[PDB]
Design a protein around this ligand. Structure first.
Ligand code: FHR
Ligand code: FHR
Lengths: 302, 299
């Protein structure tokens, strides 16, 4: 059982390089529009307190160099939507997949295609943390890298990368330029909220463990939502809602372990530790697999 | 720090579906050849002691149904090279990337594109264990999925999937059809050797932790190579060779921590554990990042 990313080919054909002045980063080329972080128009002078509308009026179409591989794309228009810049180019991307822009919720997972100088370099699975950061792996130049899910042939883009917080976690926007979390695109003192653990995902992963033959943590007991949430709060876990319990319905039916039966196991795992054992080859309780992730990996959905 | 796979697009355009009898698995379509596991030609009565030469001579081109998406590829000829079947088709794959076939050694990492019915389902990072198995994630029908690395725009194919061992780990071939390890494509009792931890990789990972600002596991001690190996074997770690020490030279220079000094830290980590702490997000010592992997992800 592994963190599995979506196949990235449909997204790779959308990645381009955008250069504005001395700043290079990545853009997403779909139809005749390249999307990228609006902070590409910042100089080190105005990174501290940018006036983006003023900085954008000062720029012209020619201030943006857009390169799809070795081919230059001519920019014929520019505009801003929230914190993303939209560069109209004269050529529609012939590799544009079926796609949509979606905003995800904390706890949901997605694949990240990390890119540098417009070139895809690596792919990995991420989750949107409860504090709206993501624990990514990004070097300088990674901005404009995107996160996505694939459903049938349709790519749902949910994340565009903007910045790294002092603690090393990452912050970005959806593809309409709306930030995830209480963050702003300016170089200033910013810190994530105290993070919490994604309870429903931990449960999903315990079900994955059971499905894969790791059963030592199961017990005879059950609990109540009310009782478990008092433990969840104590251990900095997200509260468990009736909606979560229902989403775990399928896994409860396949394994014959009811969610509040699995909560009793989880409660004991939190209250007494793991007694030097492991679960799915992990010494920690993993919280970046959704219920859907568990089913898809134990069902082989293409 | 993440287990990062290579972008899979170049491999995706090569995956096809191969059917023989009642068996369908995946094939790898490069130029005008489709590579797949030869056990596609087995029936239910053939799985214990198949005579592949005898099964193959009885096959005609039209017994192989190859589909690339909704397009059916016409099989022009077939031959067997070790444990892979090479199906000649009348159409070269126009999406054929720059590629090569490489055989890897234990400790090496690669990306796996897990596929079913010729459709890619997911991508993940894997390593060749010292006992020549891989700890993959494969369901029924995953045979023919390949493992690969990409350097510049060249795909090096290094693994094709054939079977699951009773312990749940996985066995397969290089793209010339030679199995990794003592395994054979028979459903006979086969035993994965005792596995060990890939020491040189754990060290590389500890260097990565130092690069990203963790020094809490260092200590004032050094060790001889021999003394390190005597201790580490007691934890079922692979022997560290002088080759391994040389390989770690660049990471040693960048961090200023001599290889044998990092070996001293590892000895202490094995002795103490982490005492409630984590290293690069893990509560265990990670051994599926190589020295090259660390360099690529940190710079
Ligand atoms: C874009 O390519 C990079 C991606 C960063 C770089 C390192 N790791 C990443 O994920 N983005 C940045 O460098 C931003 C640029 C700013 C421009 C003005 C608007 C805000 C973003 N800067 C930072 O991410 C950043 C982090 C940080 C931590 C401590 C002190 C300063 C600091 N700046
Ligand atoms: C190909 O798609 C599958 C991949 C398996 C299926 C489950 N998980 C995987 O990785 N390959 C097989 O099923 C092989 C087929 C045999 C045909 C004859 C030659 C040898 C391979 N069989 C097995 O993987 C397998 C494992 C196993 C363990 C214990 C009893 C029987 C058994 N069969």
């Amino acid at each position: 059982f592994r963190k599995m990313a979506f196949p990235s080919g449909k997204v790779e054909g959308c990645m381009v390089q955008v250069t504005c002045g001395t700043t290079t980063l990545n853009g997403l080329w779909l139809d005749d529009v390249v999307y990228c972080p609006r902070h590409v128009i910042c100089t080190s002078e105005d990174m501290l307190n940018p006036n983006y509308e003023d900085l954008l009026i000062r720029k012209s179409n020619h201030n943006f160099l857009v390169q799809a591989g070795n081919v230059q794309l001519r920019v014929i228009g520019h505009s801003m939507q929230n914190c993303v810049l939209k560069l109209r180019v004269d050529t529609a991307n012939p590799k544009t997949p079926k796609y949509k822009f979606v905003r995800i919720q904390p706890g949901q997972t997605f694949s990240v295609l990390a890119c540098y100088n417009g070139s895809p370099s690596g792919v990995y699975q991420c989750a949107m943390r409860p504090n709206f950061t993501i624990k990514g792996s990004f070097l300088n130049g990674a901005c404009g890298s995107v996160g996505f899910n694939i459903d049938y042939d349709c790519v749902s883009f949910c994340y565009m990368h903007h910045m790294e917080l002092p603690t090393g976690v990452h912050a970005g926007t959806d593809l309409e330029g709306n930030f995830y979390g209480p963050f702003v695109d300016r170089q200033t003192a910013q810190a994530a909220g105290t993070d919490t653990t994604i309870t429903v995902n931990v449960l999903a992963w315990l079900y994955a463990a059971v499905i894969n033959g790791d059963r030592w943590f199961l017990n005879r007991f059950t609990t109540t939502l009310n009782d478990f949430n008092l433990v969840a709060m104590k251990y900095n876990y997200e509260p468990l809602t009736q909606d979560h319990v229902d989403i775990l319905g399928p896994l409860s039916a396949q394994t014959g372990i009811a969610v509040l039966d699995m909560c009793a196991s989880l409660k004991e795992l939190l209250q007494n530790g793991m007694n030097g054992r492991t679960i799915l080859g992990s010494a920690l309780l993993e919280d970046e697999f959704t219920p859907f992730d568990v089913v898809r990996q134990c069902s082989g959905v293409t």
